[PDB]
Amino acid sequence: QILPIRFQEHLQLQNLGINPANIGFSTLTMESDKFICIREKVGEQAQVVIIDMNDPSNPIRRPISADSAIMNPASKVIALKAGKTLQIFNIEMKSKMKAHTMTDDVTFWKWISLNTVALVTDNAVYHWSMEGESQPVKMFDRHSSLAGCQIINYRTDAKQKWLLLTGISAQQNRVVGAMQLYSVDRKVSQPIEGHAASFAQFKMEGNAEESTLFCFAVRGQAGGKLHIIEVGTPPTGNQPFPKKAVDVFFPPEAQNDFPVAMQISEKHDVVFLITKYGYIHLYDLETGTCIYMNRISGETIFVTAPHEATAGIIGVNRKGQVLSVCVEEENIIPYITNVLQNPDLALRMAVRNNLAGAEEL
C-alpha cells in the first residue's frame, strides 16, 4: 500500500477553455514547469495561450502569426518562428529582444538552458545564445541515420559539450529510435538506437569532481534496455563511472509500447522513464536498479519537463491533464527494504540523498 512515488494533478487545461484538438505535440509546449503555451486558431485568428503555472486560472491569449512558440524556462521571454523568421520577445516589456532569418526551415527547436535555444533544420543543429548580439551557431551536421525521422527531442550535458538529437520512424511496423550523440571537443558523431535520453551530473564517493553521465532507454530487437555511461575522459584524479546496462520491462499486452520521456532527479539520483502508452519507471542513476514500475494511464504524456519543487517530472497528456511524479521521500527507503527486499540499495540511497527509514532494516 506504500508507493515509492507520489502523483499530483496540477491542472486540467479543458477547465481553462483549451480545445482538446490543440492539446498535442506540435501545438502545446512546456519547456519548463513555469509555463505552458498553446497555439489555437479561434475564428480566423491564430493566438498563443500562455499559462503561468503560478497563476493558472488567469491565462493570457495574444494574436500570433507564428507556426511555433516556446517559452524560456525561467522568464516570460518567448521564442516565435514562421518558416525561417525567428523572433524573441520579452512579453512583460512588449519588446522584440532578438530576430534572425535562417536559410533553412527549423523543423524542431527548444530551450536547452536559461539563455540558449537549440534549432534543428533538415540537415544541422544550431545553438542561439540570448547574450548580446549572438546569432545562431552551427554545432554539427545531422547524421544520415536520422534522415526522414520525426525529430522528437534534443538534449545536452550541463556544459553543452555532449549533444544528443533524437528521431523516430516506422521500420518493420514498429517505432524505431535513431539518436545522434555529438562530441563538441572531438567533433565526432555516434549514431545510437534509442527512444529517450537525458544527461546528468553525478559525484561518485571518493571522487573530488562530478562525472558527466549519458542515460538512454531503447526498445530494440533485444527488447527494452537502459544504459548509464560516463561521456568524456574523467576529470583527472576521478575514478571512472562504470557503465550500467539493465532491462526495461514491457508486459505482453504492451508489445507496441516504447520509451518517450526521461528526466533525472539530481536531488535523489533517480531516473524517471515514461512510455508512449502510460507506464512510469523509476531507476537508480548509480546502479540502474529498477525501483518501481506502474501504469499512470492508457493516455500518452507527449511533453515533459523537470518538476523543480519535487525534483520530479511534469507532463501533459492528450486529455490536458497536467500531472507530476516525484520520489515520495517518506516511503522510498521502506519500499526498497521491504517491498523490493534490497536493504543494500535502500541503505546506499538513504545516506547518498539524506532520506529517512534505513534506521530499521
Binding site: 498563443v48 495574444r62 494574436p63 500570433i64 502569426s65 507564428a66 518567448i78 516565435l80 518562428k81 514562421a82 523568421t85 523572433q87 520577445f89 512579453i91 512588449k94 522584440k96 530576430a99 532569418t101
Partner: peptide
C-alpha cells in the same frame, strides 16, 4: 518582417 505576436 512584422512581429509574430501582437501585444496591442
Amino acid at each position: 518582417a512584422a512581429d509574430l505576436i501582437d501585444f496591442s
